[PDB]
Amino acid sequence: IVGGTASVRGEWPWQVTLHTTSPTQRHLCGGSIIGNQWILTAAHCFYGVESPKILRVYSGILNQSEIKEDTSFFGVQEIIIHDQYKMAESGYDIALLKLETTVNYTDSQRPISLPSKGDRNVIYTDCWVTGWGYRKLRDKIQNTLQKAKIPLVTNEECQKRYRGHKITHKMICAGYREGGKDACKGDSGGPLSCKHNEVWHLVGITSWGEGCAQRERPGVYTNVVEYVDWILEKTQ
Numbered sequence: 001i002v003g004g005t006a007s008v009r010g011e012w013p014w015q016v017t018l019h020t021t022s023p024t025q026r027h028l029c030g031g032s033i034i035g036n037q038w039i040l041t042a043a044h045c046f047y048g049v050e051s052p053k054i055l056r057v058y059s060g061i062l063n064q065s066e067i068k069e070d071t072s073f074f075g076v077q078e079i080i081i082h083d084q085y086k087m088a089e090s091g092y093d094i095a096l097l098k099l100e101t102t103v104n105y106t107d108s109q110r111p112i113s114l115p116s117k118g119d120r121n122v123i124y125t126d127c128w129v130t131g132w133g134y135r136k137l138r139d140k141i142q143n144t145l146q147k148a149k150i151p152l153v154t155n156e157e158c159q160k161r162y163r164g165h166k167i168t169h170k171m172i173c174a175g176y177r178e179g180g181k182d183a184c185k186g187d188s189g190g191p192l193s194c195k196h197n198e199v200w201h202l203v204g205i206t207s208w209g210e211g212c213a214q215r216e217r218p219g220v221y222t223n224v225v226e227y228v229d230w231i232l233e234k235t236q
């Protein structure tokens with residue numbers, strides 16, 4: 001996260017850090033708890049991933065340095081990638097992780113609701129992107145989970161900034177005209193979380209952008225509301 005600030009323990013309890021363990025253990029992507037056995041993340045995350053065997057899902061993590069050889073994690077039983085996914089910038093950047101067992105929810109590990117039936121025309125004005133990613137284009141994974149408030153932009157404006165890509169209704173963009181706050185490397189797969197009537201909704205999945213936090217280049221997110229039928233089909 002560029003231009004963000006540190007979170008405190010318990011602040012974003014649906015946020016997970018997905019680790020790979022091949023050839024060595026490192027943070028791979030963010031993700032969001034959407035069910036006791038279900039993480040929603042980005043399909044792009046699994047580009048180099050030989051199978052679910054090498055994944056570890058950590059929840060309830062504030063600092064990456066909390067994770068040690070005895071820190072508990074959830075195994076991944078299945079990676080469900082959208083059948084039309086080809087590359088992040090062309091959409092369908094969405095994946096479900098089915099965990100081997102059910103998260104018992106606690107103060108530090110909680111679900112975020114999907115965008116609700118009948119909210120298709122809500123204007124979300126309280127949206128935040130979170131993650132352990134770079135604070136700038138050439139940087140490092142951050143120890144403490146970072147947060148930044150970022151405004152949504154219309155798909156019409158977004159398309160005008162990305163005339164070499166097809167910005168569709170299955171994408172949602174977010175950023176400041178002047179730049180300065182955005183996701184960056186290591187944030188993808190995590191949530192774009194928007195609060196409406198004091199309830200958090202998983203509005204976007206952090207996906208791609210041109211640089212990080214550049215002027216007039218909003219970040220691009222998977223528009224979760226357009227995949228609700230797909231999520232329900234896969235999780236049922």
Ligand SMILES: Nc1ccc(-c2cnn([C@H](CC3CC3)c3ccc(-c4c(-n5cnnn5)ccc(Cl)c4F)c[n+]3[O-])c2)c(F)n1
Binds near residue numbers: 046133182209211
């Ligand atoms: N050590 C270390 C080093 C690198 C990485 C690493 C590298 N890229 N990525 C991902 C894609 C990889 C996981 C498949 C990625 C891609 C794009 C974005 C992104 C951007 N950016 C534009 N230019 N950069 N970012 C802007 C806006 C939005 Cl909205 C974005 F989503 C975020 N991420 O995370 C993870 C790492 F994870 N660890």
